[PDB]
Design a protein around this ligand. Structure first.
Ligand SMILES: CCCCCCCC/C=C/CCCCCCCC(=O)O[C@@H](COC(=O)CCCCCCCCCCCCCCC)COP(=O)([O-])OCC[N+](C)(C)C
Ligand SMILES: CCCCCCCC/C=C/CCCCCCCC(=O)O[C@@H](COC(=O)CCCCCCCCCCCCCCC)COP(=O)([O-])OCC[N+](C)(C)C
Ligand SMILES: *[C@@H]1O[C@H](CO)[C@@H](O[C@@H]2O[C@H](CO)[C@@H](O)[C@H](O)[C@H]2NC(C)=O)[C@H](O)[C@H]1NC(C)=O
Ligand SMILES: CC(C)CCC[C@@H](C)[C@H]1CC[C@H]2[C@@H]3CC=C4C[C@@H](O)CC[C@]4(C)[C@H]3CC[C@]12C
Ligand SMILES: O=S1(=O)NCN(C2CC2)c2ccc(F)cc21
Ligand SMILES: N[C@@H](CCC(=O)O)C(=O)O
Lengths: 48, 48, 48, 48, 48
């Protein structure tokens, strides 16, 4: 549900395991999230 | 084009993808959007 | 790494939606506020 | 000319040869296969 | 293998990114994601 929407922005801590998880993921749902997160990387990926 | 060595090679290659379900996996990746909620979402009906 | 001292999992943190209470005039809700008038204008009308 | 061995077609993997109507096409006993012959991956390599 | 395609949602559409891309990485959607699978199977290089 969270991948198939653009109303709620979503990210994770940058330089963390969760960012590293979706970066090297090959699940079709989870690749959509990193396709989302990499575009507006300045906005949704917080520092802590 | 009208006579090519790539017609039969793609005809093999398309049939390989649909028995692996990958033509169905790619269609669900793009055509599935917001979910588009149904008319059975009543949740309240004050009689008027 | 050593061998783990705590088990993890990536998950989604998000706000709870507010459970707005059914306030104490809740039983007037199954009819529209003009229908309550229309019943009241009926029993003030049919009695006349 | 209805098919002799009553099958459609399958490659018996050990002694690998076709049967049914697929064997009627490869051996040129037939010229057409106007029948419920479903287009699959492993059939379209050996017949057209 | 110069591939002629046309921009239509959700088949072929430009990729949204903070940095403007150049070449085949400009395009995303269904049909180029099909064509990356056709290029993997048949083993050819393509220029959109
Ligand atoms: C079958 C019998 C019919 C009789 C005909 C008469 C019908 C005439 C009625 C006409 C309309 C009355 C109801 C208004 C419509 C409701 C919708 C609304 O928005 O109101 C809301 C405001 O709360 C109110 O202001 C309600 C009105 C208070 C007076 C209630 C008198 C009871 C009727 C006397 C009859 C007894 C004597 C009968 C004869 C001896 C109520 O909803 P709420 O809960 O406040 O939601 C917000 C809560 N929150 C803020 C926390 C989120
Ligand atoms: C012959 C034919 C007739 C001739 C024509 C005559 C002309 C008549 C024409 C009328 C036209 C209609 C005008 C009114 C419209 C109201 C609807 C509405 O939205 O407002 C509100 C109604 O909620 C109430 O507050 C209702 C008032 C209290 C209910 C008790 C009344 C009856 C009591 C018992 C009766 C005893 C029965 C005895 C039987 C013998 C609902 O919204 P709200 O959110 O609650 O708003 C809060 C407002 N407030 C802040 C001020 C509280
Ligand atoms: C629960 O969440 C918030 C908290 O009240 C409500 O939405 C916000 O409400 C504040 C005022 O309290 C407004 O300033 C914001 O603009 C509201 N934001 C949004 C997105 O609505 C919300 O309505 C509450 N209730 C529910 C059912 O979610
Ligand atoms: C006997 C009397 C006093 C009862 C109360 C008045 C009656 C006659 C009036 C008050 C409001 C009126 C309604 C107001 C709105 C509509 C919607 C319209 O699309 C059809 C008529 C209808 C449904 C009316 C029917 C008659 C009605 C119910
Ligand atoms: O037996 S372990 O190798 N070391 C101890 N722990 C835990 C403290 C929870 C866990 C937790 C999950 C495991 F899969 C293994 C272990
Ligand atoms: N706790 C994570 C970083 C935060 C995250 O990736 O969610 C880690 O140990 O790398």
């Amino acid at each position: 549900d969270l991948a198939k929407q653009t109303k709620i922005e979503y990210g994770a801590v940058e330089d963390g395991a969760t960012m590293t998880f979706f970066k090297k993921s090959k699940i079709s749902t989870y690749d959509k999230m990193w396709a989302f997160m990499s575009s507006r990387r300045q906005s949704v990926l917080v520092k802590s | 084009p009208m006579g090519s060595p790539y017609r039969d090679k793609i005809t093999i290659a398309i049939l390989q993808l649909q028995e692996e379900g990958k033509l169905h996996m790619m269609k669900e990746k793009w055509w599935r959007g917001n979910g588009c909620p149904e008319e059975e979402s009543k949740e309240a009906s004050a009689l008027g | 790494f050593s061998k783990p001292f705590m088990t993890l999992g990536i998950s989604i943190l998000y706000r709870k939606p507010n459970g707005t209470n059914p306030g104490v005039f809740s039983f007037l809700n199954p009819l529209s506020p003009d229908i309550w008038m229309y019943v009241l204008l009926a029993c003030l009308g049919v009695s006349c | 000319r209805l098919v002799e061995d009553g099958k459609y077609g399958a490659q018996d993997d050990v002694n690998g040869q076709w049967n049914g109507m697929v064997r009627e096409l490869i051996d040129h006993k037939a010229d057409l296969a106007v029948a419920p012959l479903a287009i699959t991956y492993v059939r379209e390599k050996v017949i057209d | 293998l110069i591939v002629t395609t046309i921009l239509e949602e959700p088949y072929v559409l430009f990729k949204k990114s903070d940095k403007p891309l150049y070449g085949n990485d400009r395009f995303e959607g269904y049909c180029i994601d099909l064509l990356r699978e056709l290029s993997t199977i048949l083993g050819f290089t393509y220029e959109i």
